[PDB]
């Protein structure tokens with residue numbers, strides 16, 4: 001399944017609002033799961049001189065297992081958009097696999113304000129797009145997304161009610177891992 005084509009970062013976005021705190025996914029819209037399991041996610045993005053580093057957590061709400069990654073990529077000349085290669089780590093950040101050259105994701109920020117954000121993620125391996133995801137983000141677990149971000153969903157051509165809301169999933173987070 002092809003990642004979504006009309007995706008570009010919102011211009012005028014202040015990078016300090018996006019590379020701020022930690023993010024929790026409150027809603028996600030996944031185009032074509034080759035998996036039926038539903039996930040929760042939290043991550044902590046930081047940027048310096050155009051390089052983005054982010055600690056990334058996923059919790060499988062069906063199996064009740066968690067996995068961990070560290071992404072690294074460069075900002076585009078376009079604005080708040082980056083393609084990241086990623087390490088696979090354990091909960092203590094010990095590296096299981098280094099980043100490689102075939103596995104990457106491209107994250108594009110479509111809205112970000114003081115409390116909330118809307119991003120798009122296209123996950124790829126080699127010549128294949130593996131996932132396309134929109135995620136609504138907030139800075140605390142189950143905080144309400146802002147009006148601005150709900151408007152950005154509607155402006156992306158989407159319906160917020162068609163996203164999966166993560167509150168109902170019994171999410172568990174590892175706030176230790178996403179600290180720093």
Ligand code: HEM
Nearest residue numbers: 025028035038039040041043056069086105107121123135
């Ligand atoms: C609630 C939000 C999310 C959902 C529902 C979701 C869903 C998934 C699923 C189903 C997988 C495949 C797991 C497997 O079977 O190996 C996956 C992997 C992955 N996701 Fe997400 N994801 C979420 C958030 C994010 C975010 C925010 C990012 C990036 C900042 C991200 C980046 C990745 C990466 C890099 C992998 C590959 C991990 C690997 O190959 O081991 N995901 N995600």
Ligand SMILES: [C-]#N
Nearest residue numbers: 121123131133
């Ligand atoms: C995750 N995509």
